[PDB]
Amino acid sequence: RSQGQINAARRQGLVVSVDKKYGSTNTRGDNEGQRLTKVDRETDIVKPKKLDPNVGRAISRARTDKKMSQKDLATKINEKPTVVNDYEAARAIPNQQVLSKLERALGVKLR
């Protein structure tokens, strides 16, 4: 993955996995790019990572009741102030990049 073998496996061969990535370079990651096909080929309704039961309730207070506001909090994570609004109690589909920036900007280790 990351330097574990990609130099160790390059012992005088120099070509194993040298193909190009998907190619956005500013559009966000493909953490659900596998799930996007599954919801496309499955001809029924599937539930999209339903809710945020306690990572909403407990982590809204630890983040925002400390010093901050969501208008401030969404500004340092670079999202609209309604995105954090639907991460407060309920009513969101949680994606990884937004929830990662939510964690590393205010420390509370609940994923």
Place this chain on the structure above:
Amino acid sequence: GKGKPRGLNSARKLRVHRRNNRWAENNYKKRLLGTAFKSSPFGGSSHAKGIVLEKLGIESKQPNSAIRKCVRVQLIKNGKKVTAFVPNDGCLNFVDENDEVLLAGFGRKGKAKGDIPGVRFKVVKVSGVSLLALWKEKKEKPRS
């Protein structure tokens, strides 16, 4: 056929005909009339220093509706008066009357640029320092 002479002893006609039709070319004429020396405000130079006379506001032409914040400048070596655009915002505060600015061409080799009507020049340096430095707070304008 083809309307031009072709005979082997006809080099004079082709050479004089090329010469006469070179004058239809825009830059060949200016190279051989010396229009840069006599007619252009800069004396055929990339840059010229000037003296600021007044701050100007020029209405941007259609379909833009801004005010362009340029100045009127009199050159040292010629005495001619040109209008020069003052670049990105706040720079008109950095320029004042009688600051001895430095001018450059405005990009299009003697033509106006963008929505500004009748401005062929821009300010580069004011009071001898820069405008990039003054805009980015890298240098300070001398007290004058």
Place this chain on the structure above:
Amino acid sequence: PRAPRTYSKTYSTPKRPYESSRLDAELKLAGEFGLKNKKEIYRISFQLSKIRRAARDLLTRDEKDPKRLFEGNALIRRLVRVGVLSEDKKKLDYVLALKVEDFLERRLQTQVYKLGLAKSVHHARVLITQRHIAVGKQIVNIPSFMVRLDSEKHIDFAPTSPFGGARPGRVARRNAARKAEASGE
């Protein structure tokens, strides 16, 4: 009034500046060879374009032209000696097929890596410029040395370098020094 010094530049910028084919063809030439910047790649294609201009000039001339024969063998044996033209490929129709890849192979920054002892292609670059590799008897710290055919048996660590013996350098020397003043006495 002293006679001038001749000089020239050894590279050329490509015509179209922003491609997605040429700009991403630097996957090999910058990551798979461990290079500084595109000027090291523009340099190779300049010499390689210099080669084909001479070769195209010769092929236009008649076969058994004394000029074609003289500068032909000279161009071959120069390219044979550095190992960019293979052992029997010796024909002017094959120097035109010569591409950028088998020039960066002959660089000392890769020839160190292929001859063991480097464990990465840009661990070798660090070792060369830190005055560790000597060719024959001569320390070289130029990663673009372009080794010859009778030189691959002579890439080895320098007689002065810590990895070729000779009293290891100021990091281990000082590191062993503080254990001497803490554990020894």
Place this chain on the structure above:
Amino acid sequence: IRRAAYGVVRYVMESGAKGCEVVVSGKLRAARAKAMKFADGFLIHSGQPVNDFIDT
């Protein structure tokens, strides 16, 4: 939108339908609303047979 909707029309055609049609209307990818329609087969919408053979 174009993938979610062509995956519905082709499933209904696989199910032995003679024609179906899917309309998506709203602000699809811009600030000014448009309407995209995706169809296959044929549909009749004229009269009493609408009450018989059309489901909406």
Place this chain on the structure above:
RNA sequence: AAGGCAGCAGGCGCGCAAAUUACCCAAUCCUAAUUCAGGGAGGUAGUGACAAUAAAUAACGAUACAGGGCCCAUUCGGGUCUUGUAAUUGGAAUGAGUACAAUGUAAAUACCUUAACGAGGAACAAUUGGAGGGCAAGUCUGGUGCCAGCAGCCGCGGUAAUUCCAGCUCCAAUAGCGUAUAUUAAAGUUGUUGCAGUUAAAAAGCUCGUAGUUGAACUUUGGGCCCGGUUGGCCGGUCGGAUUUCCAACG
């Protein structure tokens, strides 16, 4: 009474625009009555991002989360296949610099050597322009509201700005990068190669006519050797045509 730096160094002025009032005859050569003297010729050093060459800003390791697809599944699991985020640690190597020395040199400086110091994110910290298209790289966030401004060109901005001002992220070249003017390619948009002229720009209203440019056809085949035919026969093989060989010369 005295003068002539478009000699060397320097100053003023002019400007967009250009270096030290330094050291020496040791090299290159010159002159003289001449091996010795003299030489701002010339050389050495200082200033010097004019151009040009080479190529530092790190290299090896160890350590982890969070998903998603599929498979088997008890449901608690793996067992692959991939997606992103770093984050804490270790010994090794080196010169940029500070310098005994020696070397270099007319004497020095610097280079090339080299004792002694000289790396853990705080530094010994790389910038310059860009991210709608041309043209590589964000429909991420905050501010503004046809204002400020951007924008070579098309265009952006009038209350959800991928284009302004910012933060983050990313792209391009890189000790260099942007801007201005000129010039060359692009430009078969100067056309000899090689343009176009009915309607896009362009056939003089028409004819004569000197220079200029251009101008129908016609005037004999000695060296030899190999190859193809076309005539001339010695030769028909054959039921009026069918193969070619040895020999001329016929080009």
